[PDB]
Structure 1
Amino acid sequence: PKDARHDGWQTLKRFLPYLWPADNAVLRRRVVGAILMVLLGKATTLALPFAYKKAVDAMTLGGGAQPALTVALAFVLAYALGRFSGVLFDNLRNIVFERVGQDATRHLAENVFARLHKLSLRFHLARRTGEVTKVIERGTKSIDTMLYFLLFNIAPTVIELTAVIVIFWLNFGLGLVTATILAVIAYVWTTRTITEWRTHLREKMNRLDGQALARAVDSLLNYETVKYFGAESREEARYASAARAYADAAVKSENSLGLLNIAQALIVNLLMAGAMAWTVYGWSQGKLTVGDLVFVNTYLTQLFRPLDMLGMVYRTIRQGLIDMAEMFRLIDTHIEVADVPNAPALVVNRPSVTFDNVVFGYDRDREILHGLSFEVAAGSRVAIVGPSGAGKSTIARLLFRFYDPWEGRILIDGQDIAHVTQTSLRAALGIVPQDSVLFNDTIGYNIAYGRDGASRAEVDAAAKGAAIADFIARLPQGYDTEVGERGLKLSGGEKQRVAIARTLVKNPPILLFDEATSALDTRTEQDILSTMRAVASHRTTISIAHRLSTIADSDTILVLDQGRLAEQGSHLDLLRRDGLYAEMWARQAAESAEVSEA
């Protein structure tokens, strides 16, 4: 299986089950029909030059003005009809297949998509919409072009080349056979080596093009700054030099194409010259008819027509195979966090949260949690705070099982979250993160996202609960207002309110505020804090906060130092202890005063 040379062959064999699904009968029928269309089309194209030979033969055999007229007429008509017919077969093959190709590549994409969702968070799925989109577009085009070239250019040509070898064998040579085989070998090898050089030139040209283009775009998007420094002439010169570098590279790449074409023309035409000369010489001895010259000429031109594209085909087939290989590598990549076999669902009857001696870090060379233990009582409002090395920023990620502890365990109710299904676990958890994100869709879609079947009544109830309902009411399209971009832009407080609403639709027993107000301004922070307190009403709530004043009303506060629980208690008890929390409090207070000073 995967235990193989890892070449184009393996990638292709891996793709083969998509083309021959074994789920779908209809597609299998289509593949068969397409193959029949290939065989018919080749049969037709091989046959039609014989029709040409006969017409010539009848006019040359050949004592004057004879029934040769009827026969020659019949044969030219057969030849023309054959030409049209082969085209009909080829286009019919394309048509019958296209559904197969489209389905197979779709299923491959869907499999990759699903896996990418199963894979680890640590794969840094935070990047540019444009860059990713360009890459995926490029690869999609790559794999498609590749499939079409492989199935409908290379394979028919292998069949035709073999048939021409058998035919040329039976009726000529075998000097003819060796000459054409050597010609094909030289043609392929030459095309290949020149193509490798050409692909390198293409890459350089492409990179230069990107550079000139980046210069123009950066310049234009910075029109104000360019005016401010009166730098138009400068930017023009800057663009122009880049544009010149690009043009030089383009001239080189395009010229190298002329070289490949000429090289190919020489090979084909030496073969033409030799084959036709030899055919004439055979005719001179009465061994071969005059029709034979036409026969050989047609056979060779037909053979070498698909190889006219060979260079491009090769580059393309190469690139696609690379890209597919890449696809499969992702499908192959192992999943860091998995449900154990036959994992039970989490059942939350009492929503306590326990951290039991948790040792964790993102990377094995940097340990963040050094044996963290704490208990959060069901229904309590708790805060987790600490200074810079405390490790509090891991809590949410550990709790939703984005990662597993190196050592120790996390429990909800009485249960190790490592031993339950990931879906049931996340089903018990609500989060309002620091930067909530909106999908590119309506406010309603975004709120409804909290639970799969969510009704509009539910969206309304949640929107009320987060107090974003009036704002939505004052939009013309209300809940059908598109947001994100290109959509309406929301303020930070508005987005946090959507996030809270989303969680309200989910309606979880355990709710996490993960630096929820950290990006908000003061007035916004104070406003959203009452909504948060209200929404915390009959849930176990864990608030992870930088600014202590925002969490002072907590039932209890857990203070972390150096990956362990340093202090615990209510805000007054902690101030009374004169410990780490008290110090932080003083410090934050002092800074608040300082800003007020100025």
Structure 2
Amino acid sequence: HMFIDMENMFDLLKEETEVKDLPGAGPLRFQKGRIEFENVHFSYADGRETLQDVSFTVMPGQTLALVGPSGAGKSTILRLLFRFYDISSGCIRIDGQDISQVTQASLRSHIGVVPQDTVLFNDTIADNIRYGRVTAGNDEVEAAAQAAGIHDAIMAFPEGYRTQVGERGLKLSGGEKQRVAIARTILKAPGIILLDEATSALDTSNERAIQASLAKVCANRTTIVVAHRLSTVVNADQILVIKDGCIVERGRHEALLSRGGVYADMWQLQQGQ
């Protein structure tokens, strides 16, 4: 270790939490939104492998549900797709293009995220929807709200689209707040949707309403979902069961059941025979 270059050690550490566009990198040429992870290894802090040889394909417009126990790497897969971090080997591609080789601005422009909980800013409801694409006009925000199903609700607000919401203003209902996150995604008109499902739930009516809107927004869009809801897993095109960074099994819900493996155990456990 007398021949180690300390500056190079710091450069390597820096590369662990920094993501740079390549010199001369172009825009992603997004076409249908096919997603591929090919043999992906990834570590957050250089101690230990958070994803181990992770390979899968999401064909354009199909849904992929990631399930498995705590700490498996599910959300990690979404963060890597948004290139929050660089991976350590393997490749992530969208429509065949390595995402580490394009401008990260162009990458993210094609990807809409619905996180677990919706962050509301102390600003008008319109600006809160506009957050999904800040360049967007009031006509676009309003159209997004309408497709999110909260336009009529907003029109009834004490100052309509100008009404201050968040902490300092009018309190949105649970359903409304979740439709704002939807409206943002709608406004983005992204080709890929990453959903990370909340572990809290509203009432049955609200959950069914919210799931119905989400499926409208995700239709014809390649979707990856960190799933908590049984209904979301059952309806997916493909399910990865992930344990400790490895995909231990995969298929559609019915094929995982009839496999009688880990997924089938989980399903039997939830049923409670």
Indicate whether the TM-score tops 0.5: yes
For residues 390 and 334 of structure 1, do their structure 2 counterparts lie closer, same or farther at Cα, with a shift above 3 Å needed? closer
With CA pairs under 8 Å and 6+ residues apart, which has the higher RCO, 1 or 2? 2
Partner of 1:393: 75
For residues 459 and 349 of structure 1, do their structure 2 counterparts lie closer, same or farther at Cα, with a shift above 3 Å needed? same
Q: Which amino acid aligns with 1:455?
A: G
1:334 Cα deviation after fit: 10
Q: Indicate if the aligned counterparts of 1:450 and 1:506 stay in contact, CA closer than 8 A.
A: yes
1:405 Cα deviation after fit: 1.1
1:335 Cα deviation after fit: 7.1
- CA distance in structure 1 between the aligned counterparts of 2:55 and 2:16, rounded to whole angstroms: 30
Q: Indicate if the aligned counterparts of 2:148 and 2:213 stay in contact, CA closer than 8 A.
A: yes
- CA distance in structure 1 between the aligned counterparts of 2:100 and 2:247, rounded to whole angstroms: 22
Partner of 1:519: 200
1:566 Cα deviation after fit: 1.7
Partner of 2:43: 361
Q: Indicate if the aligned counterparts of 2:64 and 2:225 stay in contact, CA closer than 8 A.
A: yes
- CA distance in structure 1 between the aligned counterparts of 2:128 and 2:203, rounded to whole angstroms: 26
- CA distance in structure 1 between the aligned counterparts of 2:196 and 2:248, rounded to whole angstroms: 20
1:380 and 2:66 aligned: no
- CA distance in structure 2 between the aligned counterparts of 1:334 and 1:549, rounded to whole angstroms: 37
For residues 340 and 555 of structure 1, do their structure 2 counterparts lie closer, same or farther at Cα, with a shift above 3 Å needed? same
For residues 334 and 533 of structure 1, do their structure 2 counterparts lie closer, same or farther at Cα, with a shift above 3 Å needed? closer
Q: Indicate if the aligned counterparts of 1:379 and 1:540 stay in contact, CA closer than 8 A.
A: yes
1:505 Cα deviation after fit: 0.6
Please, which of 158, 168, 182 is the counterpart of residue 486 of structure 1? 168
Partner of 2:122: 440
- CA distance in structure 2 between the aligned counterparts of 1:435 and 1:336, rounded to whole angstroms: 25
- CA distance in structure 2 between the aligned counterparts of 1:493 and 1:355, rounded to whole angstroms: 34
The answer to which structure has the higher strand fraction is: 2
| Cα distance per residue 1:32-89 (max 9 Å; x no partner) | xxxxxxxxxxxxxxxxxxxxxxxxxxxxxxxxxxxxxxxxxxxxxxxxxxxxxxxxxx
1:589 and 2:265 aligned: no
For residues 491 and 366 of structure 1, do their structure 2 counterparts lie closer, same or farther at Cα, with a shift above 3 Å needed? farther
In the TM superposition, 1:190-269 aligns within 5 A as: none
Q: Which amino acid aligns with 1:562?
A: D
Which runs of 5 or more structure 2 residues have no equivalent in the other structure? 1-14
Q: Indicate if the aligned counterparts of 1:492 and 1:520 stay in contact, CA closer than 8 A.
A: no
1:472 and 2:160 aligned: no
| Alignment TM-score, normalising by the size of structure 2 | 0.89
For residues 497 and 346 of structure 1, do their structure 2 counterparts lie closer, same or farther at Cα, with a shift above 3 Å needed? same
The answer to which structure has the higher helix fraction is: 1
Please, which of 142, 158, 171 is the counterpart of residue 460 of structure 1? 142
Q: Secondary structure at the match of 1:482?
A: coil
1:468 Cα deviation after fit: 1.8
Q: Indicate if the aligned counterparts of 1:381 and 1:541 stay in contact, CA closer than 8 A.
A: yes
| Alignment TM-score, normalising by the size of structure 1 | 0.42
Which runs of 5 or more structure 1 residues have no equivalent in the other structure? 1-332, 594-598
| Cα distance per residue 1:559-597 (max 9 Å; x no partner) | 21221222222111111111111111222233xx9xxxx
Number of corresponding residues: 259
- CA distance in structure 2 between the aligned counterparts of 1:444 and 1:548, rounded to whole angstroms: 33
- CA distance in structure 2 between the aligned counterparts of 1:335 and 1:554, rounded to whole angstroms: 32
In the TM superposition, 1:48-447 aligns within 5 A as: 336-447=18-129
1:358 Cα deviation after fit: 1.2
Specify the structure having the higher radius of gyration (Cα). Answer: 1
Q: Indicate if the aligned counterparts of 2:124 and 2:161 stay in contact, CA closer than 8 A.
A: yes
1:530 and 2:224 aligned: no
**Superposition CA RMSD, Å:** 2.0
Q: Which amino acid aligns with 2:187?
A: V
Q: Secondary structure at the match of 1:568?
A: strand
Partner of 1:92: none
Q: Indicate if the aligned counterparts of 1:547 and 1:588 stay in contact, CA closer than 8 A.
A: no
1:477 Cα deviation after fit: 1.0
Q: Which amino acid aligns with 1:528?
A: I
| Cα distance per residue 1:406-425 (max 9 Å; x no partner) | 22221111111111101000
Q: Which amino acid aligns with 1:498?
A: V
Q: Indicate if the aligned counterparts of 1:337 and 1:402 stay in contact, CA closer than 8 A.
A: yes
